[PDB]
Every structure is written in C-alpha cells, then in structure tokens.
Design a protein around this motif. Structure first.
Motif, PDB file in Angstrom:
ATOM      1  N   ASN A  81       0.807  -1.204   0.000  1.00  0.00           N
ATOM      2  CA  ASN A  81       0.000   0.000   0.000  1.00  0.00           C
ATOM      3  C   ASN A  81       0.850   1.268   0.000  1.00  0.00           C
ATOM      4  O   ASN A  81       1.959   1.275   0.529  1.00  0.00           O
ATOM      5  N   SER A  82       0.318   2.329  -0.596  1.00  0.00           N
ATOM      6  CA  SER A  82       1.014   3.586  -0.757  1.00  0.00           C
ATOM      7  C   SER A  82       1.006   4.417   0.521  1.00  0.00           C
ATOM      8  O   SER A  82       1.757   5.387   0.608  1.00  0.00           O
ATOM      9  N   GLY A  83       0.132   4.074   1.484  1.00  0.00           N
ATOM     10  CA  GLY A  83      -0.025   4.842   2.727  1.00  0.00           C
ATOM     11  C   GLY A  83      -0.661   6.217   2.497  1.00  0.00           C
ATOM     12  O   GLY A  83      -0.594   7.097   3.359  1.00  0.00           O
ATOM     13  N   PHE A  84      -1.304   6.391   1.340  1.00  0.00           N
ATOM     14  CA  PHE A  84      -1.814   7.687   0.918  1.00  0.00           C
ATOM     15  C   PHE A  84      -2.872   8.157   1.888  1.00  0.00           C
ATOM     16  O   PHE A  84      -3.671   7.357   2.392  1.00  0.00           O
ATOM     17  N   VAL A  85      -2.845   9.458   2.145  1.00  0.00           N
ATOM     18  CA  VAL A  85      -3.777  10.104   3.044  1.00  0.00           C
ATOM     19  C   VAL A  85      -4.232  11.376   2.363  1.00  0.00           C
ATOM     20  O   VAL A  85      -3.413  12.258   2.069  1.00  0.00           O
ATOM     21  N   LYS A  86      -5.539  11.470   2.116  1.00  0.00           N
ATOM     22  CA  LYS A  86      -6.084  12.613   1.403  1.00  0.00           C
ATOM     23  C   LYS A  86      -6.085  13.838   2.306  1.00  0.00           C
ATOM     24  O   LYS A  86      -6.071  13.705   3.533  1.00  0.00           O
ATOM     25  N   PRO A  87      -6.090  15.032   1.704  1.00  0.00           N
ATOM     26  CA  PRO A  87      -6.174  16.276   2.471  1.00  0.00           C
ATOM     27  C   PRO A  87      -7.542  16.465   3.091  1.00  0.00           C
ATOM     28  O   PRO A  87      -8.561  16.038   2.529  1.00  0.00           O
ATOM     29  N   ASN A  88      -7.570  17.121   4.244  1.00  0.00           N
ATOM     30  CA  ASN A  88      -8.831  17.551   4.813  1.00  0.00           C
ATOM     31  C   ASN A  88      -9.326  18.767   4.034  1.00  0.00           C
ATOM     32  O   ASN A  88      -8.627  19.784   3.985  1.00  0.00           O
ATOM     33  N   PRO A  89     -10.528  18.684   3.428  1.00  0.00           N
ATOM     34  CA  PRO A  89     -11.022  19.796   2.591  1.00  0.00           C
ATOM     35  C   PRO A  89     -11.304  21.085   3.368  1.00  0.00           C
ATOM     36  O   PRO A  89     -11.564  22.113   2.754  1.00  0.00           O
ATOM     37  N   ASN A  90     -11.263  21.019   4.695  1.00  0.00           N
ATOM     38  CA  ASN A  90     -11.548  22.173   5.547  1.00  0.00           C
ATOM     39  C   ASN A  90     -10.299  22.947   6.003  1.00  0.00           C
ATOM     40  O   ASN A  90     -10.408  23.951   6.705  1.00  0.00           O
ATOM     41  N   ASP A  91      -9.119  22.479   5.603  1.00  0.00           N
ATOM     42  CA  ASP A  91      -7.887  23.248   5.784  1.00  0.00           C
ATOM     43  C   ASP A  91      -8.005  24.508   4.919  1.00  0.00           C
ATOM     44  O   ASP A  91      -8.440  24.426   3.763  1.00  0.00           O
ATOM     45  N   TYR A  92      -7.617  25.665   5.458  1.00  0.00           N
ATOM     46  CA  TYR A  92      -7.967  26.943   4.824  1.00  0.00           C
ATOM     47  C   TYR A  92      -6.875  27.598   3.960  1.00  0.00           C
ATOM     48  O   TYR A  92      -7.044  27.747   2.750  1.00  0.00           O
ATOM     49  N   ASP A  93      -5.784  28.036   4.580  1.00  0.00           N
ATOM     50  CA  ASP A  93      -4.699  28.726   3.857  1.00  0.00           C
ATOM     51  C   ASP A  93      -3.453  27.855   3.747  1.00  0.00           C
ATOM     52  O   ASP A  93      -2.462  28.230   3.110  1.00  0.00           O
ATOM     53  N   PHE A  94      -3.534  26.681   4.361  1.00  0.00           N
ATOM     54  CA  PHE A  94      -2.423  25.756   4.441  1.00  0.00           C
ATOM     55  C   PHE A  94      -2.998  24.354   4.476  1.00  0.00           C
ATOM     56  O   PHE A  94      -3.867  24.063   5.297  1.00  0.00           O
ATOM     57  N   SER A  95      -2.522  23.481   3.590  1.00  0.00           N
ATOM     58  CA  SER A  95      -2.947  22.078   3.639  1.00  0.00           C
ATOM     59  C   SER A  95      -1.817  21.107   3.304  1.00  0.00           C
ATOM     60  O   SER A  95      -0.782  21.497   2.741  1.00  0.00           O
ATOM     61  N   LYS A  96      -2.027  19.843   3.659  1.00  0.00           N
ATOM     62  CA  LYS A  96      -1.067  18.801   3.358  1.00  0.00           C
ATOM     63  C   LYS A  96      -1.723  17.470   2.951  1.00  0.00           C
ATOM     64  O   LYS A  96      -2.915  17.235   3.182  1.00  0.00           O
ATOM     65  N   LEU A  97      -0.930  16.606   2.326  1.00  0.00           N
ATOM     66  CA  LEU A  97      -1.311  15.208   2.168  1.00  0.00           C
ATOM     67  C   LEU A  97      -0.061  14.335   2.182  1.00  0.00           C
ATOM     68  O   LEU A  97       1.054  14.841   2.013  1.00  0.00           O
ATOM     69  N   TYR A  98      -0.252  13.037   2.397  1.00  0.00           N
ATOM     70  CA  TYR A  98       0.831  12.063   2.344  1.00  0.00           C
ATOM     71  C   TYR A  98       0.630  11.179   1.136  1.00  0.00           C
ATOM     72  O   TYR A  98      -0.485  10.695   0.924  1.00  0.00           O
ATOM     73  N   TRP A  99       1.698  10.969   0.359  1.00  0.00           N
ATOM     74  CA  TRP A  99       1.645  10.094  -0.817  1.00  0.00           C
ATOM     75  C   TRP A  99       2.810   9.109  -0.883  1.00  0.00           C
ATOM     76  O   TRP A  99       3.858   9.360  -0.307  1.00  0.00           O
ATOM     77  N   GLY A 100       2.633   7.990  -1.588  1.00  0.00           N
ATOM     78  CA  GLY A 100       3.631   6.923  -1.584  1.00  0.00           C
ATOM     79  C   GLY A 100       4.660   7.208  -2.673  1.00  0.00           C
ATOM     80  O   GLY A 100       4.326   7.104  -3.838  1.00  0.00           O
ATOM     81  N   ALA A 101       5.892   7.578  -2.319  1.00  0.00           N
ATOM     82  CA  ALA A 101       6.784   8.169  -3.329  1.00  0.00           C
ATOM     83  C   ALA A 101       7.922   7.242  -3.672  1.00  0.00           C
ATOM     84  O   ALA A 101       8.562   7.409  -4.714  1.00  0.00           O
ATOM     85  N   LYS A 102       8.168   6.261  -2.805  1.00  0.00           N
ATOM     86  CA  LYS A 102       9.178   5.247  -3.066  1.00  0.00           C
ATOM     87  C   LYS A 102       8.854   3.925  -2.382  1.00  0.00           C
ATOM     88  O   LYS A 102       8.433   3.908  -1.250  1.00  0.00           O
ATOM     89  N   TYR A 103       9.086   2.827  -3.082  1.00  0.00           N
ATOM     90  CA  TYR A 103       8.939   1.498  -2.517  1.00  0.00           C
ATOM     91  C   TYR A 103      10.300   0.861  -2.558  1.00  0.00           C
ATOM     92  O   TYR A 103      11.020   1.034  -3.544  1.00  0.00           O
ATOM     93  N   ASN A 104      10.674   0.155  -1.495  1.00  0.00           N
ATOM     94  CA  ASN A 104      11.941  -0.554  -1.464  1.00  0.00           C
ATOM     95  C   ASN A 104      11.658  -2.002  -1.224  1.00  0.00           C
ATOM     96  O   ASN A 104      10.820  -2.325  -0.385  1.00  0.00           O
TER      97      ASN A 104
END
Lengths: 255, 267, 257, 267, 257, 265, 266
Positions: free
Chosen positions: B45-68
């Motif tokens: 699994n990529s461990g992906f975590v979607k952004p909270n749509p209620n974050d206002y001027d600053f937001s984040k998400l986590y995405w799977g960028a490398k597999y080893n």
C-alpha cells in the motif's frame, strides 16, 4: 505431470442484476508441494443504468449510472493463501516526443505525449494472503469534441429540453457499453492449500457496482450536476466451499 | 535437470503490506551448487492520506513516493545471490536532426519513454543481498510537468499536486483531483522482482532468507501567502517497513515463515 | 554433441563498491579439438556518485560521478587464447532522408536519424590474452533537448544557495540509472586451452570506474554555473584473480585488489 | 555430412593487431572436395595519435582511415576460395516524387543508409585470394558533412576533423572532440569476415594459408593563415601490417601457426 | 527421394579481371524423369575502373568505368534444355498517393514512391539453350538528389586542376561499390538432360563488362564539365567452357577466352 | 497422393519466343480424375525496334505493348481446365477523408493504391478447355508525367507516351524519351509465369494434346513536327504455338509440333 | 477429451430469418459436467422498405436498426450458460497531447468506429444469453455520425436525409440506397458463441430456445415550406422468430421441436 480437475458454478441474483460464472481448476502439479486452486471469475454485472424525474421539479431529470464495478475474493481458511492474481497494478508509461527549432530570428519548442485510454481502468484496491479486491473505474470517453473525463459534471448530459427523463441524456450510441449494458469481468486468482490440513475451505466472491447520479437541469440548454458515489458497494456476494480431497463444490450462501 | 516448487507468504495488516514468494529449486547435474529462483510479489500500500477539505490557507497530504524491496541471505551461510531482474537500464532514445534551406532551419527531435515511477537497484546490492527502489519519477500535473519529489520553481516551489497558482479555494481543495495522481502514489504497488541464489551442496541443509518490503511516504503541503499558492514536498516523512524471515530447506525443497517484524519511522 | 560444466563465483569489495558475478561454462564439444571455457561476466558496479562542498568556500559545490565503467579480462597462461567475446565495436550507421523541391522558390532538406544510448560500450584493447572494454557516458535526454556527456553544465542544478551540496545538482529523477545507482555489466568471453598442457590457468577480471567532477559555482540575481574536471580519477578498479582447473573443473579465488 | 572445428590466433603487441581464426572443416559425401569455412575476427587498432594541444598555428593528428584484411592460399596447392562474405553491395534507396497544384510544386525525397565506414572487396580478389577494405566513408563532423578522406573545399580544404573555421586559437585545440570522431577512426576495428575454401582429396594432406591484417593511417593537419583555418588529409601516410601463415592439416583437421611478420611503411 | 551431387570450379583471368566461382549441383529426383543440373554462377568481376589524361591535353581527363556487367550461359547440346533461371524480368510496380482538397482554393497533389537499385538486372535473351543477363547502372544517391546513370556529369569531380586525372572525378566514397571495386554476381540456372542420350554436355559461361568513358573538361572561376562516351567498350568478357559428364559427374574445363 | 514431374520446351529463334513448360502429374486416391498442374514460363521478346536518329520531321518505333499466353485442350478429349493463376483482381485502394475548421473550412480526400506499368487480365475466351491471359501496357510514366498508355489522347499533342518534348528542337528520331526511361516490358523481354490446373478422365484415352500459344502485340508509336504523337495498336503481331502430347499413363510429355505466324498491317 | 458434432436449422420464409446452429459436444474426463459449445449463425433480413418515389412533401422508409439474438435453457433443467462471445467491450482509444511555444495546444484522439455495435442483453443470466446489434455511428455522406436518436433542433434527425434545402419530391430526398449501411438495408449474418454445461445426473434430453429478431425503425422526412426535416421512430415494427431444439446429451443429437413467428406493429 500436471493434472487438472475442473468445476463450474453459475449463480444469478435478480435483486443485484449480477451473474457469477465461476470456474475452479484444481491443480495437481507433482513439482509443487501444496494443493493449488485456480479461480476464474467471469460473468456479467448489469449496469442498472436508470433515468427518472427528480422529486416533483419537472425541469431537472436524473441519470443513475455505474461509476465503478467491484470484484473481490476472500477466504477464511488459514491454511489457504493467495499466491497469484490478475490483473495487477502497473506503472503508467507514456511516449514522449520533443522538438527544439531555430529559424534564421525565431525559436520553436514542442512537446508531445502519447498514450492509450481505456473507458474503465482496473485497479487493485487491496490485497493480502487471504483476499484481493479490484475496482474497475470509469476513466475517459471518446466523444465528438474530444475525450471527456469521467469526472466531468456534464458527462452524458443530453440535447432535448422534452419531459421524458431519458431525453435529458445522451443517446445509447454515445454511451460506452459498460454504461449502456454492463461489465463482463475476467479475473483470476490462484491459491495454495496446506496438504492434509482442512478438508474444505470457504471462498467468498463479490461482484457489484458503485453508482453516480448525474442531474440534468434545464436553464434553453441542459446543465450538469454530479453526485459522485451516490450509492456504494451495491454488491452481490456468494459463498462457495471447496473440498480439497473430493473436489466437490458447494454454494453455502449468498446475499 | 529437476525442478521443485513451493510458495510462502506473510502479511502485515496494520501496514497493508503482504509478500508472496515463489520458489523454484533447480537441481542440475552439470552444476555443483543448488539453484533457487525466487520470485517476490504481493502488495505494498502507498499509505496515501487525502487532504482535509476544511484546511484553509495551508494544507497537506501524504503520498507513496518510493517502494523498497530487498532480499538478503546471511553472512555466515553459503548462499549467494548470483543474478536478478530487473537490472539497471542503460536507457535509450531516438534522435532526428534536420537542416533546411529555402532562410535556414534547424531542428532536433528526440523520442523516449517516460515512466511515472522508475526502478533502480539499491546501493547495498552485493553478493548476499539484492534490493530495488521503485521511485516517483516523471509525473504530469494535467498537461504540465513532469514533476517529482524534488521539483523546484523559485516562486511556487514544488507544484507537483498543486491545482492552481491563483486559485480561489480552501487549501484542502486546491490539490489536483486524486484520480489525476499516479496510481502508485495513491493506491498499491504490486512488486514483481526476481532473484537467483546459489547454495553449496556441502553446506547446511537449511538456511535463512530475509525479505523486506517498505514504503517511503512523502509529505506534500501547499500554502497561500496573500498573492499566490506555493508548494513544498518533504521526502520520506513517514516510513513503513515489513521484514520477513524464511527458512529454506534445500534438501527437501520446503520453505517456512519463521518471523516477521513491523517498523516505522516518523519525521 | 556438447556437454557443459557450470561453475559460479560471486565476489564483493566494500572498498571499491563492486560485485562480480562470474559464470564459468566449460564446454566439451566433441567436434572441437581444444578445451573451451565461456566466461559470463555480470554483477554490479555502483556509481559511488557523491556530493560535497568545495574546500572552505560557500559558493562552490562538487558532484563526483562515473564517466566510464571499466571491464577487463586477462590470462597469463600461454596455452590459453581468447577466441571470442561480446560486445564488439560496430560501424556507426544512420538513416538519412533528403528532399529537394521548388515552387513556381526553392527548398532543400536533410534529416539524419539514429538511436542514442546513455553509455556506449567500446572495445579498448583485445589480443589473444586479454580484452578490455570501457562503457562511456555519451548522451542524455533532458527537457530542453539531448545533452552531451561533455557539456560542462551537465547535471548542474536549480537551488543556489541551499548550503546543501546535493541541491547544487539535478535531482535523482533527472539522473540516468547508471549515475544514480550504477551499472550491471553483461560481458562474455570464450577462451580455448591446448589439451593436455597446463593443468590450470589464471584469469584476472577487472571491474571499476573513472570519475569526473562537476563543480557548480553560484553567480551573479543568482544562477549556477558548471565547470568540469574530466578524468578526475581513473581506473578506480576491483580486480579478482580466479584459477581454473581444466581436468577437475575446480575454481579457486587466488586474489583480490 | 560431418563437421570438425578448431581455432588459431596470432598477435602483434607492437602494432596492437590480433587475429582470431575459427575453422570449420566439413566433409560432405555428396561433394568431391574437402570444405573449410574460415571465420576471421580479432582486433586491428586504429593507430590513432592525438594532436599535441601546444602546437600554435599548425597541428596534426593520425587517424585510422582504412583497414585491409586478406586471406589467400598458395599458387602451388589445390586450395581454392569458392565463396566469402560480405560481398559488394548493389546499394538501394527509397524515392518519393510529388507534384502539386493550387501555382505548382515539385518535390523529391530520397531515403538511404549512411555508413561511417564502407566495406568493399579488394581488386586483388581471385580464385586463391580474397580481401576486403573497410574504408572511412561518410563522416558527420558536427551535423555537418558528410566528409571523407578526400573531402575538398576550395577555401578550407578538408574540414573532416576541423572544429571551427575562425576559431580563436589554439591549433591542436581546434580539432573536433575525440568523442565526436567515429569509433573506427580512434579506437579498434573488430573484423568479421567469412571465407569458404575447397581442397582436393587427391592433393597434399597439408597446405598453407596466409592471413594479413592491416591499417592505413591518415595524417590530418590544420593551419591558420592569419585569416581562417584550413585542413588537409594525407591518405595512408603510415601503414601497419601483420601477416600470419597457418598450416592446415586437412586430414586431421588441425591448424598450426607457422609464422608471423610485422611490416610498416612511413611516408 | 532427392540426391544431390555437388561440384565446383573456380577460374580466374588476369587479362579480364574476372573470377568465376561456379557450382554444379546434379539433381537426382526420383519423381522427375530427366536428368537435372543446377548451375550457381558466382564470383567476382572487377570494375577495372581507370583514370587517365586525355591525349596530350592538360585540361581534359578521363574516367573509364563499367556501365554494365554481362552474365551469360549457353549449351551446345541438343539434349539439354534450360528449364529455370533467376533473376527474371518483372513488371514495374510503384505506390501512388493522390489528394484533392478544397479551401473555403483547390489543391491537388500526386506522389509516387518506389525503390531504386544502383544497378538493375535485365534478362537480355533467353531460350532453351541459353540465357543472357545485363546488370546496368541505373540510379545513384548523392547529396543534391538522385543522379541518373545517363547524366553526362555523373562522377565529375571538384579539383581542377590537380594534374592527376583521379582528381577530375568524385572520390571513392562517392562511388558505388560496383564502380569502385566491382560486381559479385549471383545467378542461377537449371537445365534438364534427356537420359540417357549424350554422355557429356558443354556449357559456356560468360562474365564481363561494358565500359563507359566520362571526360572531364576544365572550363572558364574554373569548373569541371562532363562529356560521356556511352558503350565506349562492349562485351569485354571472359568466357569459360565446362563439360559435364552426366553419368560420372566429372567436370572438366575445356577452354577459355 | 503421388507426384510425377516432367518438363518440355520449344523455341522460335526467329521471333525470340521460347516456352518452358513444367508439368506436375498428381494422382490422388480421393479423386476420380488425373490431375496436372502445368506451369508456363520462358520468354517473349518485345519485338522492340528503336527509331532511326536520322528521321527529320516524322519518326517511329515499334514497342511490345501486349503479351498473350493461352493454354488449351482439345474439344474431343476429356481434359478440362479446372483452375489457374493469376485470376482477375477486384482491386483495392485506401481512402482518407478529412474535414477541418479554423475559427475557414477545409475538405480533402487522399487515395492510396498500387500502380503497375503492365496489367494482367484473363482472356475473355477463357473457358472449360482453354485459359488465356493478356499482359497489357497499363500505367506508364513518361518522365514525372503521366500516366499514359496505348490510347492516351491529348487534343493537341495526341498520344505523348514516349514523346520527349512538345517544343523540342531536335530531329524526329531524337525526340523520343531515352530507352532506359521506357518500361522493361516495352523494350526487353517478358518472362511469363502462368499456372493452370487440368483434369483428365481415368476412363479416357491415355494420351491427349495440349496446345500452348505465346504471342506479342507490337504497337507503332510515331511522332511528327509543335510535336504530336500517335500510337497504333497491334500494328505487328508475332505468334508462336506449340502442341504437346501428354501421356497420362506414363507421365511423359513430348513436343509434337510448332508454328510461327505473324500479322503485319 | 472427445468431441461430437451436429447441426440444426430453422427458417421463417415469411420474415426472411433463418437460424443455423452448430453443436460441439465435449466430454472431458477432468470435468464433472457435459459441455456444449453452441455456435449460432444464419440470416436476419433487415426488413428494409424503400420509400415510394411519388410521395410529395412527406415520405417514409423502414430500416433494420437493431438485431436481437438470444439463447436460453429451461428454468427446470440442469443446463447453465457458462461462457459466450462476444462480450461487452471496455473500449480503448489513442491520445496525443501537444504543447508548443514560438503558445499552442492540441489533442488528437484515434479510435475505431462501427456502424453497428454489439452489446449483451440486460436479460443475460445463468440460463440465458442475448445480444443486441444496434445501429451506432452512421455517416450520411461525409457528415455525422448519426444514429437512431440524432437530434438537431431545426432539422431533427438527418440520418438518411439527402439535403436540407432540396428541390425534389420527398421520397427522392433520402440518400441513395447504396449510401446506407449494409445492415440497415440488407441482411445481418449473426455469429455468436455460447458454452453450456449440463449435469450428468440430469435428464438425458433438454430444451434450448433460440430467438432471432429485428427491430425496424420508421424514418420519415417532411417539407414545411422553408426546409426539410427528418424524424426516426424506433422499433415501429418488430419481427421475431423463435425456435426450440431438443438436445440429446446422451447421443449428441439435436432435433428441432417447434418454431414460432411473432410480430409487432406500432
């Protein structure tokens, strides 16, 4: 040096609008030290695409359609494990062509990317030694005036603002087969079984759909509003039991 | 020449990582060691975590960028890693140079394959260990890019999943649509690696192999300053790792799971 | 008819960052009147690409990287001869399209097309006792066109000044695999041995790299400028000495670099 | 039909020339002679010699411009060369003619393969000798050309390896980069020629074959005249030659190197 | 089923600069009721291309070169017939694309495409006793388009005035192999023989050249102008006569030109 | 299923026409007749006669514009022609229609097809005891111009098939296109390659006769001083016919007779 | 593995519909059921009716716009439909995006276009498979594509309409017959595959029902005084041919038992 024992089951649910055509191939490979079973998951999942007038409004009509088809397999026997399956997720790769040019004063630069689109893409949603789940997801459609995204709120929005709700939407010939008629899954899974342990195992196979709704609103032209994931996991589940020694199959349940 | 097959599996449900290992033991009269071809598949699994749509001027998400993925034998045993696939690519591309008079025109066109993720061998690859990294490579943001983990624009930073520079929306809603993200960044990686191992015939009948599957999740954040949006990507902000140890019985061509271990890291 | 006897050795050096995966196939061809051995040279030579701040300066950073990989085989046994090997040098060949036209104006066009590899493999020396190849950086596909391995701006980056030398150079996704990770050689050689002469023969197999250095300097509003030191380090190589017995088919590792 | 194989080699370390000969003896009950397929491979170094970067207004380099190989039997023996490869090419090209109206337009496009070096048979080829010349042919300088051994510009002379017409010094630094030169001009030629020979069964049991490998080195020089750079190429200013003589035992299908000889010529 | 008896002859003429590499395959097919013989005609005809100063002049030089190669086979034996041969004459076939367009202006385009050989092989004559081919210069790819073999300026060079006639003509790299070196024929013929009539048969095999001469004249700012003498020298041929025995499969060379 | 092969040949050195006939007798136990696959090859010279370069204002040449080959059995025997190759072509071509707007409208149609200088079609006399082909001059390019053929007609210049220039300032005998610019079959030799299958009744006679005819039609092309051209079809005909006796029992074939005929109009 | 073959046919001369059924009985020692591969071919006439040329300002034609085939076993027997062909298509197309500076954008898509499209009937289940071959993308001349429900606000459905501003009789203002798709005016030759399983502890004989059917659309055009306009009405006439066969699973024979012709007219 390989013996196959073949079994089939075919189960339909009128409620769900689903037929499961399941083939079980027991594999006696003398070179392999476990029992093996190949499950070929085929059949038919009807689109259940339907049109209707919205509430009592008379100027907005709705189309309910399958955004996604669901296919899944699970066992509960700890002596059974999933050792293979298709299809699998792949890296997306494209063909790129890039041009730099000078005319003697004049500069030009071109980049072109090319690739192949499917109407629906098949993704592995989850997978482990006891189970695998795919979702077959609406993606992109070839129309006049270009390729249209499955996330376009105008998708399937029609040309006759008519009072018959079917007329608020594109005709069948501009609907892909997976929306007009439905999906013929073709999936495969291979499982190992520890010899001389459990005499039987259960496998639960799940076929179904997630439905979007597109509202077409008369404003005179038609404008599109989308309700994504309006109905989810509308699924038909059937529970099969295999006998590793006698190769009998039993249907043990269904919703 | 004789062939014996078996399989073995291990899962971490907490991490959504599973390994499937397919073993082909070859005995060959012309060779003085035992051969094992080991195919490593399953899910990460990529461990992906979607952004909270209620974050206002600053937001984040986590995405799977490398597999080893890595497969190793033990320093004390007689097991060597002799071959494997995929191997690093000496990449190729097509070129067309044109010169024209009518006014002088020059042009050069190149044609090549572009992958969203690229597989290369681990630094740590040696005679008792082989590892690959499958890493986010050239990712298209609509028709723009490619971008990657380290893309940098002097003003907007890393625009990898940024929807617009001058967008009037909440931060948590100014990322590109999830379906526009590459498959491996939001979903599941289904590894497919091959290794070939040799085992001395005077050695121990049993030996141990350790297989490690891992993901590196990147933290992608976007922020409004008053004038425009900009983006930042932080690599390997979370790491999830699943290591399994298997015992090979070379004499009887069997393989047993011995042990598993989950480890994580968080920056 | 043909009998094969197969042997393998795998040797790693931490000092050099090299693994040699060697396969020895003794060939017993009844139709051939000498002994034969095919050596399949595979493995992994890591790029050992490294970044650092130049001396005590704050505006000059350096990337050291493999401009070339070295692969060589040698014997010292007079009774052994190299009779084949791959790859071999080829003539360069290209596709040409030429057009000539006119309206009633005049026009001429010439186009050449070909295929580029990132690294090219060249035979550097070969005789009956030995063969040496060099796998040399050649051409790279970037945005803004193909870039030559001799471009002084090659791999120069976008983030002046971060203080981190890695930031003076392109990110890993714009580095070819052979620079970011390394090279997996695949070379082959076939030798003959005079029957009933020496019981044993020695072969030395050499795997290694030549490193360039790219210095990135900050100037002027700020941008990065490239300067190259070509062949900064040459023949950074791992040599292993193998001994074969032609009667017993035993292999021995006799030595290492 | 039966087949017997063997091989032989010969070296000149001084010239960096090496011969590998692979021999397939064929006895065919349907034919009244013995047959021998003879493959000639190995190495012929280019003899390339870089320019001294310190020459001021006049510089030179030596490059490998033609490679000659020949294989021949003795006038007094019963051995003939009956076939061989490669043979001279009757070359082909593709044509597209177009005629348009709207105002009139004519156009012709031709498509063909362009080789760096071209192989043709030696004029001395006959029933007891076959030979080939692999000769520099169509060499692209910088996307300019093609140039060759005899290329001629009234002003600039031969611009084959000339870097710039008006370069601001230095001769010896005004040749094109070594890496831009074609491979056979600067490195090693790896010949690959085939010959078939017939031998009478009522003849001598042993016979002699002679194999010559050779390079022609051209002398390329450039000069500044106070106004512009110009170039000159002098063909075969140096010649290096390695000839070996092998004894074929037709009865026992063996081959021995009998002798070797190094000869050079210097203009 | 099928038995083949193979024979070879190899004959060189210094006068003619020709080597004939001839292969004779006697065919014993049980399903065929005559004797059969396949003749594989190979070898080498050197171009005998030569350059020389014209008469006593100083501004006129000449290149003599092979416009056509000749290959011919004939028998004297009434019991022998030609039943197959290659290559054979073929109908010209080309690809046509045609477009017609309207812009609201009308446009019309026609384009034809095809493949050119430097030299074309034509069957000049053929009957039950003989076949003759000519291999004729046709078209050549140069910079500045395709040149016809009938252009009086073909091969005309760039170096007036060197004094060396070789410099009045294009360099070797701009000559086709069939002109710089020569032709390697490959022709095949199958003959039947009525069994058992004549014990032996004669075959006369012919290889040679027809030569053109191109004069290059220095003119006027001085350039070279080409003048052609076509069929300057015709049937410069080497003929060899072979006699086969249909019972013993002996070959003997009975004569030469 | 057994196969017996033989061959037979005939020549006209006068006409430079030569027939090679290859015979495959097939006996197949599953079939009630004898089978014969007959391949017809050899040579038919074009009869080409170059122009005399001394013709001043009016010149001509003869060229090979059509070749006829025919194979026939006798009305009184039990031999039928059951198959043959080549057959008439239902020709194909590729099409691309395009419609474009720019916010200006554009239509185009492109067609792609094969073009041959000579076309092969079946003789309309073909029937159950006879097959024949005509190999006829078809689409001939003059230079980059054309195609022209045997009946090309320009209201001013007439037939410009082998005409070098319309306003050329040379002798008539020198205003024909170069010989090497003419199609191979018009100036050289046609090498036929035709296949026919025949059936013979087993209760029939053991021997039968097959007649094989090779023929050229020569056209007269002439030019006169502007310049104009005329082509006159089949102004000379040359025909060579040979009859062979097939021995169906012993699978032998034997040349029985030949005949040369010409027509000059 | 052993294979037994047979065939059976049925005709409706009135409707110009004919069924050909080719049967491959497979007995496979590795499987516990009998297998039947059933191929359905034959003919389904379009029912096309040309327009009368004398119609003045209003004219009509009937055309074959949809063909339906279905193969069914009996709800009381042990016979299942396990596989079949063709299956619904997850359609594909090619894309080329280009971005150019000198600023230019373009996107090209490449795909296949069928005048008639085949898809599974929504009544497909474990005892019945059916297909519909429906008029899809039809080109008038080089205009369109059009279909059964094409709609232009003014001219309506211009599917077979020759011109908008045409000076001619209605009934001479449809497109030429040869410009119509083959299936719209001629005959449809179906090719469908089904695989059926039959239990070995079942009855030795069972029944299969095969239905071939056409939907004829009514297309009409009218002149209003300013322009021509067209309308298409779907399935204005229906013609249906159903046959039932008895499969003898034991001896691998098939026997036609009954046929029926049915129609509907709106």
């Amino acid at each position: 040096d390989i013996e196959i024992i073949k079994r089939t089951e075919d189960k339909t649910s009128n409620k769900w609008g689903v037929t499961q055509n399941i083939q079980f191939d027991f594999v006696k490979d003398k070179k392999y030290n476990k029992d093996a079973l190949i499950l070929k998951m085929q059949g038919f999942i009807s689109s259940r695409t339907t049109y209707y007038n919205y509430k009592k409004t008379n100027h907005v009509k709705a189309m309910r359609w399958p955004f996604q088809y669901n296919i899944g397999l699970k066992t509960n026997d700890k002596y059974v494990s999933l050792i293979n399956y298709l299809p699998k997720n792949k890296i997306e790769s494209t063909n790129v062509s890039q041009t730099l040019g000078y005319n003697i004063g004049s500069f030009n630069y071109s980049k072109s990317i090319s690739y192949t689109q499917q109407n629906y893409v098949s993704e592995v949603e989850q997978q482990n030694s006891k189970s695998v789940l795919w979702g077959v997801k609406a993606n992109s459609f070839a129309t006049e005036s270009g390729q249209k995204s499955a996330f376009d709120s105008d998708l399937f929005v029609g040309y006759k603002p008519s009072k018959d709700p079917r007329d608020y939407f594109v005709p069948d010939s501009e609907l892909p087969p997976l929306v007009q008629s439905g999906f013929n899954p073709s999936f495969i899974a291979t499982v190992s079984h520890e010899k001389g342990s459990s005499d039987t195992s259960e496998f639960e196979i799940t076929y179904g759909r997630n439905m979007d709704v597109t509202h077409a609103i008369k404003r005179s032209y038609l404008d599109g509003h989308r309700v994504h994931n309006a109905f989810v996991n509308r699924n038909y589940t059937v529970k099969y039991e295999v006998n590793w020694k006698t190769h009998e199959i039993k249907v043990k349940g269904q919703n | 020449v004789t062939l014996y097959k078996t399989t073995a599996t291990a899962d971490s449900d907490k991490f959504k990582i599973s390994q499937i290992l397919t073993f082909n033991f070859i005995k060959d009269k012309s060779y003085d060691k035992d051969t094992l071809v080991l195919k490593a598949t399953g899910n990460i699994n990529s461990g992906f975590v979607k952004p909270n749509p209620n974050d206002y001027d600053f937001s984040k998400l986590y995405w799977g960028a490398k597999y080893n993925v890595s497969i190793s034998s033990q320093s004390n045993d007689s097991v060597n890693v002799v071959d494997y696939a995929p191997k690093n690519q000496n990449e190729e591309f097509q070129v067309q140079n044109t010169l024209g008079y009518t006014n002088t025109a020059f042009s050069e066109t190149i044609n090549y394959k572009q992958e969203s993720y690229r597989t290369t061998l681990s630094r740590n690859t040696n005679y008792k260990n082989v590892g690959w990294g499958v890493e986010a490579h050239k990712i298209m943001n609509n028709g723009w890019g490619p971008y990657g983990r380290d893309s940098f624009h002097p003003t907007y930073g890393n625009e990898l999943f940024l929807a617009g520079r001058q967008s009037s929306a909440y931060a948590g809603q100014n990322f590109i649509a999830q379906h526009q993200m590459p498959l491996l960044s939001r979903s599941n990686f289904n590894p497919e690696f091959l290794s070939v191992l040799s085992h001395r015939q005077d050695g121990a009948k049993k030996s141990k192999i350790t297989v490690t599957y891992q993901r590196e999740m990147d933290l992608y954040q976007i922020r409004w300053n008053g004038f425009y949006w900009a983006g930042a990507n932080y690599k390997n902000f979370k790491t999830r790792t699943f290591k399994s140890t298997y015992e090979i019985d070379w004499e009887n061509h069997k393989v047993k799971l011995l042990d598993t271990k989950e480890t994580e890291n968080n920056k």
